[PDB]
């Protein structure tokens, strides 16, 4: 039932540490924020507006995949309308990308070399993450060494 499903939702989003009075109080905001919208044009078309924004900034086959599933999801319509609202409130290679040295019955295409510049950015993004790691190892310890004892030790905080 619904009065339990607000208690289960509040459990998954919060790992246990209190957790004896606070769980009852976070179920209170579970009732209290559900009605703020309720106080104050197809459904599958709301997926297509996102599939447009995929193909605009590249990756066609992904946009073909989002529309492939929702068309077999028509044969449940109230479910997808929740997913489209939480889609901008979430978190912020391989041998096969631009290959032509493989394949059997491939038509002629000639040289392209304007996506070869987007063959170096697939790898530049990987190695720029593996340097920001080294930028997040020298910071997380110098932010503790520079400050007085109490910032990494709870006991000198007593």
């Amino acid at each position: 039932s619904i009065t339990q499903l607000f208690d289960d939702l509040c459990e998954a989003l919060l790992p246990a540490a209190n957790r004896k009075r606070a769980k009852r109080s976070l179920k209170k905001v579970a009732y209290n924020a559900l009605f703020t919208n309720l106080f104050q044009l197809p459904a599958r078309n709301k997926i297509l507006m996102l599939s447009f924004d995929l193909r605009v900034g590249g990756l066609g086959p992904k946009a073909d995949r989002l529309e492939e599933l929702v068309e077999e999801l028509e044969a449940v319509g109230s479910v997808l309308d929740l997913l489209v609202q939480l889609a901008g409130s979430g978190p912020p290679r391989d041998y096969f990308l631009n290959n032509k040295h493989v394949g059997r019955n491939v038509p002629y295409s000639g040289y392209d070399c304007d996506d070869l510049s987007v063959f170096e950015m697939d790898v530049q993004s990987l190695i720029s993450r593996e340097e920001c790691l080294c930028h997040s190892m020298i910071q997380e310890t110098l932010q503790v060494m520079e400050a007085a004892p109490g910032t990494g030790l709870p006991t000198v905080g007593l």
Partner: protein, 59 residues
């Protein structure tokens, strides 16, 4: 029926991963069971954002 609603849960799984939502697997299974009742889906987006803000203030 449970074979049928299993396969609908699998297809709903993939569309919620490529859209990079704030949900995970278990909270997705809760919300699909919740909207199965008839609960307004514009309403569940307003509760989850505020519940996740009030839980983050404890941490």
């Amino acid at each position: 029926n449970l074979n049928a609603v299993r396969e609908t849960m699998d297809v709903l799984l993939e569309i919620s991963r490529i859209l990079n939502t704030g949900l995970d697997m278990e909270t997705l299974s809760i919300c699909v069971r919740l909207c199965e009742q008839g609960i307004n889906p514009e309403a569940l987006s307003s509760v989850i954002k505020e519940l996740r803000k009030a839980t983050e203030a404890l941490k």
